[PDB]
Amino acid sequence: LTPLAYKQFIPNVAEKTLGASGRYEGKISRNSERFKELTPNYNPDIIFKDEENTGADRLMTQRCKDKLNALAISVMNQWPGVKLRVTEGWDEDGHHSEESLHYEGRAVDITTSDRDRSKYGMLARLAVEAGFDWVYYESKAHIHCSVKAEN
Amino acid sequence: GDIVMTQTPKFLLVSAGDKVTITCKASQSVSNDLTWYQQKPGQSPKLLIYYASNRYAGVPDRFTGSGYGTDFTFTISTVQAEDLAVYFCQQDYGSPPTFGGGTKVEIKRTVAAPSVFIFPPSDEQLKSGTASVVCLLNNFYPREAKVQWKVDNALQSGNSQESVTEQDSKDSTYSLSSTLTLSKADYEKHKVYACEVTHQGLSSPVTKSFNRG
Amino acid sequence: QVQLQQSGPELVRPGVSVKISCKGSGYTFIDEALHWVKQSHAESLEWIGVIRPYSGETNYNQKFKDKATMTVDISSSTAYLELARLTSEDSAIYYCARDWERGDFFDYWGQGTLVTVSSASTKGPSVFPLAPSGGTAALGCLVKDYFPEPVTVSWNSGALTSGVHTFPAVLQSSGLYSLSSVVTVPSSSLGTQTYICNVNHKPSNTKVDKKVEP
Ligand SMILES: [Ca+2]
Ligand SMILES: [Ca+2]
Ligand SMILES: [Zn+2]
């Protein structure tokens, strides 16, 4: 396992292209019918920042949950006593790019539980192995991970 | 070698409705780790743009950013009166984070004549041995103005200081104070105190005056 | 709702130290890192360093390593910056600023602490009325002979904001500052409405309410 480099993205194509996570199907709000397609993740081994105090960080698509749960296991295996941490999941605060996959519950920003920035490259590589459709070493402070839509 | 951000231009004078273009150039590539802040007069900086092109939540459409590597561009498509500020770029690709020197954005508007007021010294100040006489030019444009003190019709020099407010965020005007400082002894030797104001907005100079006892 | 509240202005002799504070509210203090930023005429904005209150870890800009010490008190949601062996190059506005775990850039900023490094003594201002006089009347307060900057002026304890102009201070030949604050009001209001300028010069503990009447 080789850590991703700073600003590296895998696969080597734009996020919203067919070979990666594919196209934006539009914003999901708390009002929407599509809100019901979002399910909360209560994995006791994932730390959710939830600075919003709304539980929004836990809300994501079924595929997002599945890859996230896989990555939870591989993080605990990589570093004893450390857990996967989500800073953002589904977003209703407009805290992302203009048509962010966060707005439809298809992306997570992640760190390790210890917020050790030196682990983040390897954390990104674990996200690729866990089967995220697109992984991007987006900032010094986080890894952005996204998935294809259910449809 | 720390990263150096060179911002241009240093100043821009722009009318409402017009475009603002600001350039930030890094001494070496900073990927897209480039942030634009707005600092309005007397306030702390406010985040508008991060990752070179992402607007922060609630930031209006007229603000955009572009670039990758060394060369970054910040644009206000149609500047508004309330956009007067210093705009600064910051890179955080390299440690330490480093800022541009800023671009002051000042608003051009139509001419507006000052309203003029004169204030005699307070009896309270006079008790203490000094006389301050104040002349106010309120809500005018442009900044250029000639404020002359006359004392029994004698043109004063060397005994006055002026201050000018920052541009108003709503009407784009300035205000100006001129203070004439004399000893109580000198103040009491003269009768007529006049502030004479010359400005593009006035067809001829406006004088406000008072007579000491 | 997120706010960073900084301590007041400081006068300090060269070679003395000063410790300033930044209190966070409207968020969980250990959720975000706190940065310190200097603003001077000579050098515009400069990053001093960061403290992570969750781990107590610090990272200093090497240009400030011998100057600056950062600490936190989690219980009081307060960060401290201590600046040692000061010179006049250290005179500046010091800001604290929060990041939001997106990178080392800042969504929330303190109001700033003005630090004046000087051998000069503090002196509180004298406050004198600028007495008024349909239509418009102007009145004000002259805030004369103080050191150092800054001073604040409000009108009627903050109830009067429309039409207020508080001028930038001018340095007098004496090395003391002076400014006026003015306001325009209806001439009809002069019989009836009380007008008081509330002046605060924190470095001298000088607070003055001055009633301004015809
Ligand atoms: Ca969150
Ligand atoms: Ca959010
Ligand atoms: Zn993301």
mmCIF file of C-alpha atoms in Angstrom, chain A:
data_model
loop_
_atom_site.group_PDB
_atom_site.id
_atom_site.type_symbol
_atom_site.label_atom_id
_atom_site.label_comp_id
_atom_site.label_asym_id
_atom_site.label_seq_id
_atom_site.Cartn_x
_atom_site.Cartn_y
_atom_site.Cartn_z
ATOM 1 C CA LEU A 1 0.000 0.000 0.000
ATOM 2 C CA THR A 2 1.400 3.400 -1.189
ATOM 3 C CA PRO A 3 -0.045 6.633 0.293
ATOM 4 C CA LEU A 4 -1.679 9.079 -2.206
ATOM 5 C CA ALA A 5 0.360 12.275 -2.788
ATOM 6 C CA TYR A 6 -1.006 15.710 -1.805
ATOM 7 C CA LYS A 7 -3.754 16.818 -4.345
ATOM 8 C CA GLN A 8 -3.579 13.307 -6.033
ATOM 9 C CA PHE A 9 -6.934 11.857 -7.180
ATOM 10 C CA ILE A 10 -7.797 8.206 -8.035
ATOM 11 C CA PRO A 11 -8.870 7.254 -10.501
ATOM 12 C CA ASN A 12 -6.857 9.821 -12.638
ATOM 13 C CA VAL A 13 -10.080 11.492 -14.102
ATOM 14 C CA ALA A 14 -12.635 14.171 -13.043
ATOM 15 C CA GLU A 15 -14.905 13.119 -10.132
ATOM 16 C CA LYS A 16 -18.190 13.465 -12.051
ATOM 17 C CA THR A 17 -16.966 11.314 -15.069
ATOM 18 C CA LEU A 18 -18.318 7.804 -15.796
ATOM 19 C CA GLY A 19 -15.083 5.967 -14.716
ATOM 20 C CA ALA A 20 -15.086 7.770 -11.325
ATOM 21 C CA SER A 21 -18.304 8.683 -9.336
ATOM 22 C CA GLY A 22 -20.304 9.936 -12.383
ATOM 23 C CA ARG A 23 -22.668 12.872 -12.752
ATOM 24 C CA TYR A 24 -24.388 15.181 -10.191
ATOM 25 C CA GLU A 25 -28.116 14.160 -9.987
ATOM 26 C CA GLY A 26 -28.874 17.424 -8.087
ATOM 27 C CA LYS A 27 -29.108 18.774 -4.495
ATOM 28 C CA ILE A 28 -31.057 16.776 -1.793
ATOM 29 C CA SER A 29 -32.731 18.940 0.926
ATOM 30 C CA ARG A 30 -34.402 17.853 4.230
ATOM 31 C CA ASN A 31 -37.830 18.650 2.550
ATOM 32 C CA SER A 32 -37.187 16.425 -0.547
ATOM 33 C CA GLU A 33 -38.669 12.976 -1.356
ATOM 34 C CA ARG A 34 -35.053 11.883 -2.193
ATOM 35 C CA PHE A 35 -34.152 12.676 1.514
ATOM 36 C CA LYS A 36 -35.616 9.198 2.357
ATOM 37 C CA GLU A 37 -32.916 7.535 0.108
ATOM 38 C CA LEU A 38 -30.388 8.881 2.755
ATOM 39 C CA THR A 39 -29.879 6.562 5.757
ATOM 40 C CA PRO A 40 -27.925 7.388 8.970
ATOM 41 C CA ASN A 41 -24.641 5.484 9.729
ATOM 42 C CA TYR A 42 -24.454 4.464 13.472
ATOM 43 C CA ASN A 43 -21.215 2.386 13.195
ATOM 44 C CA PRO A 44 -19.763 2.585 16.762
ATOM 45 C CA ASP A 45 -16.218 2.504 15.233
ATOM 46 C CA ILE A 46 -16.646 5.732 13.081
ATOM 47 C CA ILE A 47 -16.222 9.162 14.757
ATOM 48 C CA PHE A 48 -18.706 11.736 13.326
ATOM 49 C CA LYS A 49 -17.633 15.378 13.979
ATOM 50 C CA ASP A 50 -21.289 16.601 13.813
ATOM 51 C CA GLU A 51 -20.146 20.194 14.661
ATOM 52 C CA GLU A 52 -23.625 21.073 13.140
ATOM 53 C CA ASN A 53 -25.323 19.222 16.112
ATOM 54 C CA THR A 54 -27.876 17.866 13.529
ATOM 55 C CA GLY A 55 -26.482 14.336 12.762
ATOM 56 C CA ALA A 56 -26.183 15.411 9.046
ATOM 57 C CA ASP A 57 -22.585 14.036 8.886
ATOM 58 C CA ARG A 58 -24.046 10.511 9.492
ATOM 59 C CA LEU A 59 -26.529 10.785 6.546
ATOM 60 C CA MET A 60 -25.335 9.287 3.196
ATOM 61 C CA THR A 61 -26.394 6.862 0.383
ATOM 62 C CA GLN A 62 -26.420 3.039 0.780
ATOM 63 C CA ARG A 63 -23.198 2.708 -1.387
ATOM 64 C CA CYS A 64 -21.473 5.499 0.631
ATOM 65 C CA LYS A 65 -22.362 3.625 3.894
ATOM 66 C CA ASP A 66 -21.010 0.338 2.497
ATOM 67 C CA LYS A 67 -17.608 1.736 1.400
ATOM 68 C CA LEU A 68 -17.383 3.819 4.642
ATOM 69 C CA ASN A 69 -18.083 0.689 6.812
ATOM 70 C CA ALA A 70 -15.349 -1.239 4.884
ATOM 71 C CA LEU A 71 -12.843 1.629 5.439
ATOM 72 C CA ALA A 72 -13.712 1.693 9.220
ATOM 73 C CA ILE A 73 -12.371 -1.902 9.473
ATOM 74 C CA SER A 74 -9.143 -1.217 7.459
ATOM 75 C CA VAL A 75 -8.311 1.956 9.504
ATOM 76 C CA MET A 76 -8.476 0.042 12.877
ATOM 77 C CA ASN A 77 -6.256 -2.682 11.301
ATOM 78 C CA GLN A 78 -3.714 -0.094 9.946
ATOM 79 C CA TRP A 79 -3.141 1.827 13.261
ATOM 80 C CA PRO A 80 -3.908 0.212 16.674
ATOM 81 C CA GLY A 81 -6.386 2.294 18.737
ATOM 82 C CA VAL A 82 -7.163 4.702 15.829
ATOM 83 C CA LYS A 83 -10.571 5.059 14.121
ATOM 84 C CA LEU A 84 -11.995 6.502 10.898
ATOM 85 C CA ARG A 85 -13.449 10.065 11.406
ATOM 86 C CA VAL A 86 -16.016 11.905 9.186
ATOM 87 C CA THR A 87 -15.979 15.768 9.281
ATOM 88 C CA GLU A 88 -18.683 16.099 6.533
ATOM 89 C CA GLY A 89 -21.212 13.648 5.011
ATOM 90 C CA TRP A 90 -24.494 14.935 3.611
ATOM 91 C CA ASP A 91 -24.293 18.771 3.705
ATOM 92 C CA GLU A 92 -27.125 21.356 4.014
ATOM 93 C CA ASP A 93 -24.766 24.325 5.050
ATOM 94 C CA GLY A 94 -23.407 25.076 1.484
ATOM 95 C CA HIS A 95 -19.856 24.345 2.829
ATOM 96 C CA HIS A 96 -18.646 22.670 -0.448
ATOM 97 C CA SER A 97 -18.181 23.229 -4.230
ATOM 98 C CA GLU A 98 -21.290 24.568 -6.083
ATOM 99 C CA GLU A 99 -22.590 21.071 -7.127
ATOM 100 C CA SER A 100 -20.836 18.976 -4.460
ATOM 101 C CA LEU A 101 -21.645 15.223 -4.258
ATOM 102 C CA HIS A 102 -21.994 16.090 -0.487
ATOM 103 C CA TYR A 103 -25.345 17.805 -1.329
ATOM 104 C CA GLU A 104 -26.829 14.380 -2.374
ATOM 105 C CA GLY A 105 -25.164 12.243 0.344
ATOM 106 C CA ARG A 106 -22.552 10.651 -1.999
ATOM 107 C CA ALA A 107 -19.357 12.042 -0.388
ATOM 108 C CA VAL A 108 -17.534 12.077 2.947
ATOM 109 C CA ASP A 109 -14.585 14.158 4.086
ATOM 110 C CA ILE A 110 -12.446 12.017 6.414
ATOM 111 C CA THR A 111 -9.459 12.011 8.799
ATOM 112 C CA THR A 112 -8.117 9.605 11.399
ATOM 113 C CA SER A 113 -9.525 9.909 14.978
ATOM 114 C CA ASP A 114 -6.131 11.321 16.184
ATOM 115 C CA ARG A 115 -6.144 14.091 13.441
ATOM 116 C CA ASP A 116 -2.507 13.086 12.604
ATOM 117 C CA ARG A 117 -2.058 14.742 9.169
ATOM 118 C CA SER A 118 0.946 12.382 8.462
ATOM 119 C CA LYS A 119 -1.593 9.454 8.234
ATOM 120 C CA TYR A 120 -3.911 11.127 5.636
ATOM 121 C CA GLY A 121 -2.082 9.946 2.451
ATOM 122 C CA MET A 122 -2.331 6.296 3.652
ATOM 123 C CA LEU A 123 -5.965 6.976 4.834
ATOM 124 C CA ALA A 124 -6.714 7.997 1.192
ATOM 125 C CA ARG A 125 -5.082 4.766 -0.143
ATOM 126 C CA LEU A 126 -7.238 2.724 2.350
ATOM 127 C CA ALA A 127 -10.335 4.604 0.975
ATOM 128 C CA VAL A 128 -9.369 3.477 -2.600
ATOM 129 C CA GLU A 129 -8.911 -0.201 -1.397
ATOM 130 C CA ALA A 130 -12.311 0.050 0.521
ATOM 131 C CA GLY A 131 -13.905 0.756 -2.916
ATOM 132 C CA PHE A 132 -14.708 4.475 -2.972
ATOM 133 C CA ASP A 133 -15.347 5.431 -6.708
ATOM 134 C CA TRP A 134 -13.235 8.672 -6.329
ATOM 135 C CA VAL A 135 -10.612 9.645 -3.691
ATOM 136 C CA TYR A 136 -8.943 13.086 -3.620
ATOM 137 C CA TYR A 137 -6.222 14.300 -1.143
ATOM 138 C CA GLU A 138 -8.120 17.596 -1.218
ATOM 139 C CA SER A 139 -6.493 19.541 1.693
ATOM 140 C CA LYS A 140 -3.870 19.210 4.461
ATOM 141 C CA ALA A 141 -6.876 18.672 6.782
ATOM 142 C CA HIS A 142 -8.954 15.979 4.949
ATOM 143 C CA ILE A 143 -9.488 13.326 2.230
ATOM 144 C CA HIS A 144 -12.624 13.683 0.034
ATOM 145 C CA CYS A 145 -14.200 10.329 -0.959
ATOM 146 C CA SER A 146 -17.267 9.823 -3.178
ATOM 147 C CA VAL A 147 -19.393 7.030 -4.750
ATOM 148 C CA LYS A 148 -21.573 6.405 -7.830
ATOM 149 C CA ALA A 149 -25.348 6.974 -7.372
ATOM 150 C CA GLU A 150 -27.618 3.950 -6.542
ATOM 151 C CA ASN A 151 -29.114 4.661 -10.041
#
